[PDB]
């Protein structure tokens with residue numbers, strides 16, 4: 001007493017998440033996450049470093065403290081709660097509209113109907129209100145989902161081609177022609193990409209990332225990622241809508257992957273705050289939920305990060321699901337490309 | 347090149363892309379109108395939060411000398427500024443169907459009375475391409491009321507008698523059962539209501555207003571505003587959705603007015619930060635565009651402001667369109683009810 005605000009994960013809906021996250025002021029807010037056998041007190045704060053628009057729809061990000069291992073996403077149409085528990089990433093995805101929530105629930109349920117696992121509920125679960133019934137959200141444990149599904153191993157081998165006020169850098173994401181992407185999925189990739197940068201050498205002092213999403217007429221002419229990125233970068237130079245923004249970062253996004261289960265690709269060490277030009281800082285990325293951190297990994301390459309030898313590094317040559325740079329060499333390259341110097345400290 | 351908004355072709359996307367680029371340090375935006383330009387330093391309004399049926403609405407301010415404010419939601423954007431003391435609004439909706447509906451809604455009263463002065467009071471704005479559909483509407487509400495010769499709606503008898511972190515006070519607005527309101531109109535009332543409070547004794551140090559909008563089952567049992575407010579306050583005490591929020595501020599909102607052209611009504615001196623209880627801080631307000639500041643005037647009464655003698659005061663007994671408290675007695679009453687003391691200064 002006074003009663004701390006809480007989120008009941010057995011019935012969490014869009015309106016539950018929106019009313020709690022919209023109450024988060026400048027000083028932050030304590031929110032207890034609750035479920036059967038689970039509790040977590042999280043100090044939630046507004047992410048003021050990153051801006052996101054998806055087809056002009058404003059998307060706000062929220063963080064917990066480092067020890068909370070919790071992030072949120074909030075748009076007018078959907079909300080996401082994502083946290084780490086016993087080394088696994090769990091997302092609660094809630095769409096405001098009943099039709100879209102039903103469509104999202106069916107989309108995420110569909111891969112599990114052929115397997116029909118006994119422990120399906122720990123990987124995927126439709127959540128219903130505490131009062132037929134239609135789901136108010138879906139729970140997806142991506143790590144448990146990967147163990148139930150027989151997904152072909154998608155990786156990052158050869159996913160790069162060699163060539164007082166923070167600076168605002170736009171990350172212009174373009175929905176590939178003919179591709180369908182989900183806002184919860186695109187925004188999670190953006191959030192992980194931005195947070196992988198800010199976690200390095202206090203880089204929020206140097207850069208604030210502004211993600212935007214639009215549709216492009218460009219489509220990769222084949223399944224080949226190298227040919228796809230070549231064409232994407234060429235399409236940007238010939239696009240009148242991109243005129244005057246050749247010094248920003250660009251991503252072609254899709255739901256799927258490229259040939260040889262390539263998750264994404266980018267021009268290596270192609271963005272520097274002083275010399276950025278000719279749409280060089282460009283890449284491609286999947287946005288599917290089961291591969292978190294692909295855009296973060298490709299943004300890493302664009303900022304100069306090479307593949308790292310630690311299997312827990314975001315920049316490991318194989319896809320792992322780890323979302324942070326662990327390589328000190330990569331951290332120094334990335335931070336120096338964003339204007340940081342060793343004498344500035346962290 | 348400084349960022350600019352062309353008032354001869356301004357659309358939702360023009361306003362959204364400019365306002366979404368406004369960072370913490372503010373942004374210079376040039377308003378271009380028939381060869382004359384007004385440079386405005388635009389800042390995010392961090393004092394007020396707004397949700398309309400959970401849709402996040404952001405406010406933006408110019409400098410005091412700019413006499414300019416903006417509203418931005420996912421569905422609409424508003425630019426409002428003064429010229430010769432007259433209030434001019436540019437209202438742009440994102441969706442083509444809703445923009446056409448809004449343009450028809452605002453044009454309709456002027457089609458009965460085809461005035462000579464029509465374009466200066468109301469104008470559909472089209473894109474700069476030389477079967478076009480409007481991208482926004484321009485409304486000068488002072489010129490519009492003179493053309494439409496609307497019946498004089500007033501405030502006579504519109505009241506019923508009985509820190510380091512600012513206090514968050516919710517202003518819970520409830521769309522009366524059977525009433526239809528427009529988001530640009532509701533948010534303009536909220537913005538003017540909040541800014542009338544912050545302009546007094548540096549009150550943003552004491553309070554941050556959080557407006558929310560939901561629909562209620564309550565409808566006034568008659569055209570009488572006194573009976574309507576009695577029933578509204580009683581409906582709140584019996585409403586399970588309002589349980590635990592009897593210490594907040596409440597408004598019943600509608601598009602229209604009450605009997606004897608009453609624009610709104612409220613319980614006089616019914617909100618104090620220390621003693622707020624039993625849904626006492628409640629009122630009713632029109633939200634129609636032609637009567638700006640009605641919610642501000644009613645919020646004034648709730649905070650203890652009486653009718654003022656200056657015809658330019660927001661609290662003048664007659665409706666004027668002035669949006670600020672000028673009475674020092676009212677300013678002291680309002681600020682003291684929000685925790686301010688004379689020794690604190692402004």
Ligand SMILES: COc1ccc([C@@H]2CC(=O)c3c(O)cc(O)cc3O2)cc1O
Pocket residue numbers: 170172174212214215216239241242245363367
């Ligand atoms: C800074 O504000 C902006 C950010 C990105 C853009 C992008 C820029 C861009 O590259 C682009 C595109 O390739 C396709 C499309 O449909 C829309 C696009 O708009 C425009 C802006 O005005």
Ligand SMILES: COc1ccc([C@@H]2CC(=O)c3c(O)cc(O)cc3O2)cc1O
Pocket residue numbers: 019020023516518520558560561562585587588589591
């Ligand atoms: C953000 O926190 C809140 C603020 C206002 C409310 C209001 C509280 C409220 O009074 C209310 C109502 O009378 C009718 C309705 O349909 C919804 C309502 O919700 C609930 C909240 O959880």
Ligand code: PRO
Pocket residue numbers: 013014015016095096097098101135136
């Ligand atoms: O807005 C919400 O939260 C509920 C659940 C989905 C449909 N409407």
Ligand code: PRO
Pocket residue numbers: 009034035038085090121122139141
């Ligand atoms: O049991 C689950 O799937 C997760 C773990 C924490 C809360 N819900």
Ligand code: PRO
Pocket residue numbers: 307308309310313327328
């Ligand atoms: O993973 C890496 O790249 C660094 C090199 C030394 C040990 N870890």
Ligand code: PRO
Pocket residue numbers: 310326327328329
């Ligand atoms: O000190 C270390 O081991 C970290 C991890 C690899 C490179 N730097």
Ligand code: PRO
Pocket residue numbers: 357358359360439440441442445480481
């Ligand atoms: O692009 C825009 O903002 C407007 C919306 C209606 C048509 N064009």
Ligand code: PRO
Pocket residue numbers: 352353354378379380381382
């Ligand atoms: O007045 C201006 O500056 C712009 C140019 C075309 C019409 N509006």
Ligand code: PRO
Pocket residue numbers: 430431432433488666667668
């Ligand atoms: O133009 C005028 O005289 C009125 C007075 C305040 C708002 N506009």
Ligand SMILES: [Zn+2]
Pocket residue numbers: 156157159160297301307315316317
């Ligand atoms: Zn790689």
Ligand SMILES: [Zn+2]
Pocket residue numbers: 501502504505643647653661663
């Ligand atoms: Zn009055």
